[PDB]
Amino acid sequence: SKIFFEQGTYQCLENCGTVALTIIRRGGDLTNTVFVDFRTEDGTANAGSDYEFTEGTVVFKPGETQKEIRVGIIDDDIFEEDKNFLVHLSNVKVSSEALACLGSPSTATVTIFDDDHAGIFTFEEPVTHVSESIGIMEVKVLRTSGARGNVIVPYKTIEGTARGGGEDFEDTCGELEFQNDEIVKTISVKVIDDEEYEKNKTFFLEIGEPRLVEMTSKEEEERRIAEMGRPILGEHTKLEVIIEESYEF
Ligand SMILES: [Ca+2]
Ligand SMILES: [Ca+2]
Ligand SMILES: [Ca+2]
């Protein structure tokens, strides 16, 4: 009798390649032979660009309340904001081999989350404490908001009350190479033991501007939003390293 959409709202990723939506019959009749016509309407997302066209008929054989439809999701590499498109149910039968009914929701809203932000690069903490022991130390550099593309993130150590050159820490410079879909990377810095106490030895580890490696009204804002999917620095671009002393014994 009543036949409608499981979830009034769906969501997916642009690279999902496709998105499954489920339809149901509530009751008011048993079985069998009910089929529902579905089709996609455009929201802020358009067919042929953000997704694929999607119309067909769904057949209900006996003893079943669950059928799924699948809409193709078009993927490219151009950063976009979130966009939506609708899927409508219509023309219920009426086997004749009845009357209505629509049911609710007869339409679903699919949200396509984009996966082309080159990422925001940041340290996890503004300050870290480490003992003189432990020699080398691992420092994670994060890529958030997106993993798309090969990004190069430069870094270096800045001498504080703690001196480098082989006194307190061993100077380190270079650039981390973030592969596509890759998120985390560690920086190794050599902390050495002093025959000497001193106090609160502080030195810094900084990351520079990231950059990626080589190889109409709507279209304009579309290309402007695209320029916002480039690699940028995050909340913490500089790490202060405090060194704890002792414990002799
Ligand atoms: Ca898209
Ligand atoms: Ca994409
Ligand atoms: Ca895209």
Task: Write the DSSP assignment of 189-235 as a string of letters.
Answer: EEE---S---S-EEEEEEE---EE----HHHHHHHHHHTTSS-EE-S
Report the SS3 class of residue 125: coil
Structure token digits, residue 145 = 């908001």
Distance 213 CA to ligand 2 centre (A): 17
Comparing CA positions, the residue from 117, 162, 114 lying closest to residue 137 is 162
As beta bridge partners, residue 152 has 177, 211
Report the SS3 class of residue 109: strand
Which residue is it, tokens 């802020």?
44
Q: DSSP letters of 45-107?
A: S-BTTTB----EEEEE-SS--EEEEEE-----SS----EEEEEEEE-------------S--E
Report the SS3 class of residue 22: strand
Evaluated on CA atoms 148, 123, 225, 109, the torsion sign reads positive
In terms of DSSP bridges, do strands 107-113 and 9-13 run parallel, antiparallel, or are they unpaired? parallel
Residue 182's Cβ-count burial label (10 Å; 0-12, 13-18, 19+) is: middle
Q: Are 45 and 14 in contact (CB under 8 A)?
A: no
Could you give all domains of the chain from N- to C-terminal order, each with its CATH number? 1-118 (2.60.40.2030), 119-249 (2.60.40.2030)
Surrounding ion ligand 3 within 5 Å at CB are 76, 78, 80, 114, 116
Distance 16 CA to ligand 1 centre (A): 11
Compute how many other C-beta atoms are within 10 angstroms of the C-beta atom of residue 224.
Answer: 9
Distance 114 CA to ligand 1 centre (A): 6
Structure token digits, residue 129 = 């404490």
Q: Please, which experimental method was used?
A: X-ray
Distance 46 CA to ligand 2 centre (A): 15
Structure token digits, residue 170 = 């061993």
Q: How far apart are CA 186 and CA 198, in angstroms?
A: 28
Structure token digits, residue 215 = 């190889």
Distance 74 CA to ligand 2 centre (A): 8
The number of the ligand nearest the C-alpha atom of 115 reads 2
Q: Which amino acid is at 124?
A: E
The number of the ligand nearest the C-alpha atom of 48 reads 1
The number of the ligand nearest the C-alpha atom of 225 reads 3
DSSP state, residue 29: S
In angstroms, the first-to-last Cα distance of the chain is 82
Q: How far apart are CA 229 and CA 131, in angstroms?
A: 39
Compute how many other C-beta atoms are within 10 angstroms of the C-beta atom of residue 114.
Answer: 21
The number of the ligand nearest the C-alpha atom of 74 reads 1
Q: How far apart are CA 171 and CA 49, in angstroms?
A: 49
Distances (CA, A) of 34 to 55, 60, 150, 160, 203: 17, 5, 50, 75, 71
Q: How far apart are CA 206 and CA 67, in angstroms?
A: 54
